[PDB]
Amino acid sequence: MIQQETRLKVADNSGAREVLTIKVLGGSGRKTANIGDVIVCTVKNATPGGVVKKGDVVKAVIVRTKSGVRRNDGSYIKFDENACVIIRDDKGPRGTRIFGPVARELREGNFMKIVSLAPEVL
């Protein structure tokens, strides 16, 4: 359950090492988000270099959360850390790799380049 003022790790090589969120897109009054949902956020720790630099405002997608998700069969997938990936306003990543596991529910959101450039779909 991700709301504004929540710090997330970036799971990509965009430059951003860790970021925090401002809004959850998707509706007036929308308050929370889970895997497959986009958020506006501003990086707080960048790598020296990288395409994204510290203090920028960026669109981003949640790829793993500690709250996790119910699946239609009564199966639940949970994780040990929140995480996110930056996007280029086309459901495409800004970086060239992607670190760590990803949840299968991103397949539906048509974040296919995120699902294709991933260590483990789950």
Next chain:
Amino acid sequence: YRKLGRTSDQRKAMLRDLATSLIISERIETTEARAKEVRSVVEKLITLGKKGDLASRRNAAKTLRNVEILNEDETTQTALQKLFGEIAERYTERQGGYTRILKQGPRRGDGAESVIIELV
């Protein structure tokens, strides 16, 4: 279950003390609520007594207080010994009950329905 207008430690203590005293006297006078709540505790202790194996003895030692009864002819024995030698035999064939309750009229200082809980 009931709380008896009292905390947890003070109730645990009251219930076990009241059960011990009942075992000593075989019939006591108290208020309905506490009779209704000591019924189960004393009934379960007698069950621990209908087996008499060392495990049940050790386990029933948890609840009973350590008291001494002077029987006829200056014979002395404690609450555990009474439970396991004078009350186990009496209810070896009965498969429940073990206690009855006889409502009495309200007391004077309060409007509490005094009752007499007795070992049957």
Next chain:
Amino acid sequence: TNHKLIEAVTKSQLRTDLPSFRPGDTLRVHVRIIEGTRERIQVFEGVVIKRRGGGVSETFTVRKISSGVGVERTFPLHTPKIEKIEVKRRGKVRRAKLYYLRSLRGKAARIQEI
């Protein structure tokens, strides 16, 4: 038991081809993933963390490490989506729920066989 009518109406959904295990055992659960246009199988491997009330309502949890990122999947025990469960190896624990593995990584999360 539980209510008899609950137990009767849901007895047909219980699986019997399943093995017997306990928390702490590391195992391989196989799952029919009907992703794409194929019913593939993904051998999920983890350490059982807990399991809950009987009936169709029993659910068990398994924990693993993917890329240094802990992942846990709860599965209903009698889900028809599980092809098979192999207790790949036994485990000597002293709990019934193993929540205390969410803070350890590496040899600290060690388990003795049998």
Next chain:
Amino acid sequence: TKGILGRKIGMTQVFGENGELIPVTVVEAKENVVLQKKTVEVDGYNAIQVGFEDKKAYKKDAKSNKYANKPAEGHAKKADAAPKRFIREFRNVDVDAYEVGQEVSVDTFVAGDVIDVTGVSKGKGFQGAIKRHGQSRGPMSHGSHFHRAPGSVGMASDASRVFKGQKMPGRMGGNTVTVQNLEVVQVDTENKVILVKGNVPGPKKGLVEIRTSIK
């Protein structure tokens, strides 16, 4: 079109055709009997009355609703039935497809209908504005003394009164609620149980009036 009186037993789960977890409630409908056939010229509206369960027969010196009273024995004996415990009626039904004295059986429902279950809610007793009415309560710190009470009950001199409908503390529960567009997953004819997808109102051991969606 269809209607059955039942009682709620609990909830469980079933697994669906594609693996989906289905949340379900077990309802027990047994010996539902028609006791009358209301008619437009006799009573002004056409409908049928169904009795559910089974009370015991009259006894002299009864002290509980367990046994039927003389008034009820007579009503049920005119339908050659045993005294029943819960009696309701249905209007949506075609009165001419039923006969005074038939059994309404669980199999009236097939798998995949759309039904409305009407029961009574669980009692929460006397409650306050935050649980009963969903009100945001006040600050818990910063020197507040307004934790859970409801706020202003009105204005000032204009309307020197509290208007009707002001959401204030009191009893919660004990209200008839109709959940709509539920469906039945299976009907079992031997244990006499209609399984309904979702959850229904009421305490365990209650009463539900299942009939066919009006929408």
Next chain:
Amino acid sequence: AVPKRRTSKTRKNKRRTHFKISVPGMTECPNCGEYKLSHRVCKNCGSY
């Protein structure tokens, strides 16, 4: 939070219409014939 006016004798006597003690639940005792409370032990005799 103070009475804005007096409660007349009429209002007073009206409010306390339902303020009364109920006659006790007493039945005659089968061994002695004296009255006892129902479901309690007779205090005159000591029976059932």
Next chain:
RNA sequence: UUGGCACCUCGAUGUCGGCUCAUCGCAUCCUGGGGCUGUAGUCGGUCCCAAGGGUUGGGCUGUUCGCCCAUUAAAGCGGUACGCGAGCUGGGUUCAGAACGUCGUGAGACAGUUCGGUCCCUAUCCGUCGUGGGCGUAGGAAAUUUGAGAGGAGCUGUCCUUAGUACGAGAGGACCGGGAUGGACAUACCUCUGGUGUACCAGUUGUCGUGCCAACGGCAUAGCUGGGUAGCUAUGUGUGGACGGGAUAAGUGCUGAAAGCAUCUAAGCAUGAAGCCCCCCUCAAGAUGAGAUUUCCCAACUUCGGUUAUAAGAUCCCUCAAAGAUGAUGAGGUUAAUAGGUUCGAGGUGGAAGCAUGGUGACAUGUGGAGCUGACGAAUACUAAUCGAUCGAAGACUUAAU
């Protein structure tokens, strides 16, 4: 709004912002219907009908306001003692302390700043939210009820399709309808995910005690720590606002004359909105108009009912919870499973005690998923609902049919 007047209030009408709760207008911010346009459709602008619903989260200031950062379909304007302090705060302002700048010879002063500065009240009445008793409904009762009325909902996004089609040098680009998913919000429920679970299980520290080791109890926030049943719960699970009628608003017409033409109008007759009415959910015969259906009860003294006691039915009393502040509601009272206990089981905890083996010891292993197990499921009268008491009909006239 800034004012003017000084009419109620100085034997006191708390004044600003914020919080909680709203309620009403419409000169409408979005959504619905239209006339238009210097409208090709998307675009926008303008005006009309529309108040049913909806009409964000933050940074900065005590701020209202305003600016800014992200969103949204929109982030509307006002009334309500600039709504609401016997509902809350008290940052600003307006007591006493202090300090700076300025004015004053001075005491002191400034609507100039600045730091600090006690928010009392057990609700009588009306009002409002729930919940009982009495009586009336021309007999006394048990159950099922129609609905005069009343209340609640009423919001809307994106994607796909038609279609890259119409319309477009192009660039761009649907209308309709027809599918699919959301946001917010309201409800019901605990199966699942979790929360809590102070008479459940387990580990452990200090200390006192049952002489003693071993076992256990008291105290230390439940001493602490890991779990956790029932119940109660959301952030969890379903469901809902779906159709569809009838009358309309601005508007669009048809036939049609006064005024042989015309012309939406005067006769009449069409169509047309999230608006009106119904439709959908809930309460509802104290609806004193007191309604309807089925059933049950039905004598015998009067000296004339202003009549006992009894039916049918309840209650007293008592065991209880699916109900509960109390009373009510509901499950039960021996011809009995209502609760307790007993027996079995579910779920929870996790390998009891005592033995035997191994170790110098701290310990480990087998017995034995053992032992324990509050509310959860079933059976069993073993214990308690033993005895008894109280209340409760005999049915009015008048007229018309019979």
